[PDB]
């Protein structure tokens, strides 16, 4: 029995080793299904199909890399389903034709619940399958070591989540005033997350942000941000807890604060940036 691949690599009689590269799905989210079709990669034929019948089956299969670290699943062979990575001998396949035929082997791999980042790196071996070939004419047995590798990188969708109302404004009522600002953040994948505020400051404590108005700024007053009735200094990560599909409210309120001496009038304006930090 002689086995060949799409490339120049081939398995001669008496067994041997060969490497085959397969391009898998490049985009797969959480709970997605990955299919690796080894049938369209290796074709085997019988050396003496006229009188010798070959029995070819997958003896064992070992997963390598992210396939054994960030995925699992099943292996389909002639309709039979076995584990992946495999631990049992696959069903025997009878080959008695001179013409080469595809190997009826495929892999259905699903990522683990901790999927994230590049699941399988391109240019690295994905699995190694050792197949035992036997014939009824004699007791000769051959071992074929097929190294299935990946040519295109596959990155599981970790999940990039944005904040509602980018570039959102608010207005204070008069000098004595207080206004909550609407800012809700949601993420499709539950994870720990925090937010910290940045901007220009006025005092040493980094509490009151400076007034950067252009049309006669009112000196002696600035804008403060409070969460749950508490002053939030700039550059101070605040734990938002575990945020899931249901959006959580940041719960920030805009207030006034005193910076200098005499209080002028006419305009205040402060630019505040917010930035998220994961873990």
């Amino acid at each position: 029995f002689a086995c060949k691949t799409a490339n120049g690599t081939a398995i001669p009689i008496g067994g041997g080793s060969a490497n085959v590269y397969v391009n898998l799905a490049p985009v797969v989210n959480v709970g997605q299904n990955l299919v690796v079709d080894l049938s369209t990669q290796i074709f085997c034929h019988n050396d003496y199909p006229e009188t010798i019948t070959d029995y070819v089956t997958l003896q064992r299969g070992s997963a390598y890399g992210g396939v054994l670290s960030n995925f699992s699943g099943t292996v389909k062979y002639s309709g039979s389903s076995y584990p992946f990575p495999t631990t049992s001998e696959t069903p025997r396949v009878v080959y008695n034709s001179r013409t080469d035929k595809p190997w009826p082997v495929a892999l259905y791999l699903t990522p683990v619940s901790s999927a994230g980042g590049v699941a399988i790196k391109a240019g690295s071996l994905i699995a190694v399958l050792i197949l035992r070939q036997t014939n009824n004419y004699n007791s000769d047995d051959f071992q074929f070591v097929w190294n299935i590798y990946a040519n295109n990188d596959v990155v599981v969708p970790t999940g990039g989540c944005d904040v509602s109302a980018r570039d959102v404004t608010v207005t204070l009522p008069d000098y004595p005033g207080s206004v909550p600002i609407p800012l809700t953040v949601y993420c499709a994948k539950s994870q720990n997350l925090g937010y910290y505020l940045s901007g220009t400051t006025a005092d040493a404590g980094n509490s009151i942000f400076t007034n950067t108005a252009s049309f006669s700024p009112a000196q002696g007053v600035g804008v403060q941000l409070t969460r749950n009735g508490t002053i939030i200094p700039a550059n101070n990560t605040v734990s938002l807890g575990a945020v899931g599909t249901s959006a959580v409210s940041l719960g920030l309120t805009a207030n006034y604060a005193r910076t200098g001496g005499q209080v002028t009038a006419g305009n205040v304006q402060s630019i505040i940036g917010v930035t998220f930090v994961y873990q």
Partner: protein, 800 residues
């Protein structure tokens, strides 16, 4: 309360219409229909029937005893409240001393003032259950569609497609949800979840029937199908969810108490003489210790420090949380068997910041008990220890007994130092098996069970901005010697706006051999401080990202990109980056990715091009949600659980404020994509963007939705014209302040001067009635049809 008409004008006749404003102007009608504001705080608006009696206006507005109790009044604090029947009128004027009630028909204000003694103490931010709106009877669908056209050097004819559908119903208080997925490759269906949920408000619990998952706080989070009754902290008040020690104190007199932390005030109040216990302090977490300062009237001050530390498995004093789940077990793997299991977990709080918790798990082939105590040591920190006993049986029908012990430690050393986050140690014996491994197969990763697990988390602060995160996980096994290791370190800094982050990760799996290292650096530079404030710059909000990676094995990867917005209201976002890879496996080239996603009033749409050395794929995706209710079917952005149905018949293209392009649909309806659960939600429309011929009655609405519910936000609009009428009577101007009411609509106005009257929301033609004393005129006015184009209309009409 009499006003001299000579002040208003020098004319001897002047106007008698000031007589309506001289006294309290009591409304003769019983149905006041005025919003009630108790203790200067608005509660709700409803039709209130006023009964004749000894009142300031002569009519006492009848209020239900249950309604008063829900508003904040205490039945026990006022004598005679329990004696009166539920349907009997509550005489707050007589039964409650120093109670003032006033009605204003013009302002539609029901001003109620009651003493603070009659009101019971409540936690900050408490919302009465009455204001919680269960929702409306409506369907809901959410569709997401993604597609790929990846092309490679060999076999590049590939086209993948994913279609996720989420259906749901909100019949009454019951909520039903279902999920489905379609996968297309170059047409296999799939099924994920079916479930229903109900909120038991009196028990403050949730009942879930169908598929679901249990909390992983005590036992491993597992996926089940059956009935779950769980207590949630969402229904609790905002200032009472989490862990916060109860503070007791002795006050000599009417003193002022201030508790602060991290150099900032966290709470303050006034305390009458005697003993006071406070438990409304917010869940600080691990910010640091608390400082309590009490200032007496005489000036004496007492200051003391109370430690603060919270392990995740802690509860507030005098609080309980339970979770029971019963039914079949669905692992997600077709090989695993599906048995029946019943799990019940409970956590309870004891004074001096103690917690006790216990969990039971029963099945046909599994029996597990767990009992643990979480003690808040204080200055040292907080620690929780639990011990679990299991009597399991492997698929080979062999019984196995096992024990496990878990230690969790937390501390808050932010007082001139760094505060650790979690130190966890789990130790299991040779025969302790979790519920997952019991049903692997009928008649395998069960060869080795977890023996020792160590988790370490450290957060260090350098300067004001520099932060260092350290995480470490170490896992052993019984029999074998391979150890799983996961280490992560990270430095985060920011000079003014530029963000620097440097990460170093080490990974060593159990079955795999060889440790893998990953050192990455990322720099973010916003293109805002480098440019002046120009309205039409078109380059604002853009930023550049620099990423560098190193596997330490000889592979270099670099990425440089710019991202920003290119639309008027930031409805569009673009991000273009170019990469460069070399070494390692040998593959090298110039990577590139250009993505563009637009969020609109119909549905999000994203298009992305990726170019590499030999791989190129095109992402095209569209996502959107649809809501079906009694009034019709409205499209919109993907509805994220709680959603508010903005209703405004009359405003066609009105835009919701403080939202990313959420515009009203063609009929005027709209759906808010993200809404906060169990909290006050404010919805406001930009009146500037509203039609010039339509004026909104109110531009701000408040709604408090429950989770998984749809809440209507009413917004009434008037499409009438604004008119400046010059009414004359007997060839003379009308008196000052004569009240004019339109018969066609509900509009009304007051005479300004020289017989001029301003009316809003008036039709092209119609009749009005103006009265000042004891209906003097009934006038009519017809205008040309072309007057609708004009913003303002001025005309004159007499009376008979």
């Amino acid at each position: 309360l009499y006003f001299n008409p000579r002040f208003l004008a020098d004319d001897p006749q002047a106007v008698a219409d000031l007589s309506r404003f001289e006294n309290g102007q009591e409304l003769p009608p019983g149905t006041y229909r005025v919003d009630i504001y108790l203790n200067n705080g608005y509660m709700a608006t409803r039709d209130v029937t006023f009964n004749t009696g000894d009142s300031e206006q002569g009519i006492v507005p009848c209020l239900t005893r249950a309604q008063l109790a829900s508003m904040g009044l205490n039945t026990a604090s006022v004598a005679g409240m329990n004696l009166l029947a539920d349907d009997a009128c509550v005489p707050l004027t007589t039964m409650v001393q120093d109670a003032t009630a006033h009605l204003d028909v013009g302002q539609q204000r029901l001003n109620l003032t009651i003493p603070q003694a009659f009101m019971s103490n409540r936690a900050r931010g408490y919302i009465p259950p009455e204001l919680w709106d269960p929702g409306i009877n409506a369907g809901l669908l959410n569709y997401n569609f993604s597609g790929n056209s990846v092309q490679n050097r060999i076999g590049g004819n590939s086209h993948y497609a994913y279609l996720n559908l989420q259906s749901g119903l909100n019949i009454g208080a019951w909520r039903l949800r279902d999920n489905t997925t379609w996968s297309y490759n170059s047409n296999k269906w799939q099924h994920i979840n079916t479930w229903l949920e109900r909120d038991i408000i009196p028990l403050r619990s949730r009942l879930t029937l169908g598929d679901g998952y249990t909390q992983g706080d005590i036992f491993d989070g597992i996926n089940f199908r059956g009935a779950q009754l769980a207590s949630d902290d969402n229904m609790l008040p905002d200032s009472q969810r989490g862990f916060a020690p109860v503070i007791h104190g002795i006050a000599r007199g009417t003193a002022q108490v201030t508790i602060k932390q991290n150099g900032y005030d966290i709470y303050n109040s006034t305390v009458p003489p005697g003993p006071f216990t406070i438990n409304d302090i917010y869940a600080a977490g691990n910010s640091g210790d608390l400082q309590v300062t009490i200032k007496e009237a005489d000036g004496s001050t007492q200051i003391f420090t109370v430690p603060y530390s919270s392990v995740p498995l802690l509860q507030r004093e005098g609080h309980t949380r339970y979770s029971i789940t019963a039914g079949e077990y669905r692992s997600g793997n077709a090989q695993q068997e599906k048995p029946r299991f019943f799990q019940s977990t409970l956590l309870h709080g004891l004074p001096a910041g103690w917690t006790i918790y216990g969990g039971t798990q029963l099945a046909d082939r599994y029996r597990a008990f767990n009992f643990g105590i979480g003690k808040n040591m204080g200055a040292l920190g907080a620690l929780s220890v639990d011990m679990t006993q299991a009597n399991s049986t492997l698929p080979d029908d062999s019984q196995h007994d096992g024990q496990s012990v878990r230690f969790l430690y937390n501390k808050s050393l932010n007082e001139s130092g760094t505060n650790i986050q979690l130190v966890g140690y789990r130790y299991s014996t040779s025969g302790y098996f979790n519920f997952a491994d019991t049903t692997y197969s009928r008649m395998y990763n069960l060869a080795y069970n977890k023996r020792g697990k160590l988790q370490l988390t450290v957060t260090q602060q350098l300067g004001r901005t520099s932060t260092l995160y350290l995480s470490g996980s170490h896992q052993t096994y019984w029999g074998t010697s391979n150890v799983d290791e996961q280490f992560q370190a990270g430095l985060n800094t920011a000079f003014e706006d530029i963000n620097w982050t440097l990460s170093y990760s080490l990974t060593k799996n159990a079955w795999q051999k060889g440790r893998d290292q990953m050192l990455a650096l990322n720099v973010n530079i916003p293109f805002s401080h480098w440019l002046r404030s120009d309205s039409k710059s078109q380059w604002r909000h853009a930023s550049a990202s620099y990423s560098m990676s190193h596997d330490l094995n000889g592979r270099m990867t670099n990425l440089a990109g710019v991202y920003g917005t290119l639309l008027e209201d930031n409805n569009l976002s673009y991000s273009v980056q170019t990469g460069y890879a070399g070494g390692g496996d040998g593959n090298s080239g110039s990577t590139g990715y250009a993505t563009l996603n637009y969020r609109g009033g119909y549905g999000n749409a994203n298009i992305g091009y990726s170019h590499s050395d030999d791989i190129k794929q095109l992402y095209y995706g569209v996502s959107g949600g649809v809501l079906a209710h009694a009034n019709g079917v409205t499209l919109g952005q993907p509805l994220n659980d709680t959603v508010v149905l903005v209703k405004a018949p009359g405003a066609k293209d009105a835009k919701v404020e403080n939202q990313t392009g959420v515009r009203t649909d063609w009929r005027g309806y709209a759906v808010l994509p993200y809404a906060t659960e169990y909290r006050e939600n404010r919805v406001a429309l930009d009146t500037n963007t509203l039609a010039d011929n339509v004026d909104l009655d109110n531009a701000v609405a408040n709604v408090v939705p429950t989770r998984g519910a749809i809440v209507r936000a009413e917004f009434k609009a008037r499409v009438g014209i604004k008119l400046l009428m010059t009414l004359t009577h007997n060839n003379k101007p009308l008196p000052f302040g004569a009240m004019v009411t339109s018969e066609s609509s509900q509009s009304s106005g007051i005479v300004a001067d020289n017989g001029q009257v301003y009316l809003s929301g008036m039709p092209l033609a119609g009749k009005v009635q103006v009265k000042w004393g004891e209906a003097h005129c009934v006038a009519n006015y017809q205008l040309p049809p072309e007057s609708q184009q004009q913003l303002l209309t001025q005309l004159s009409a007499e009376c008979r």
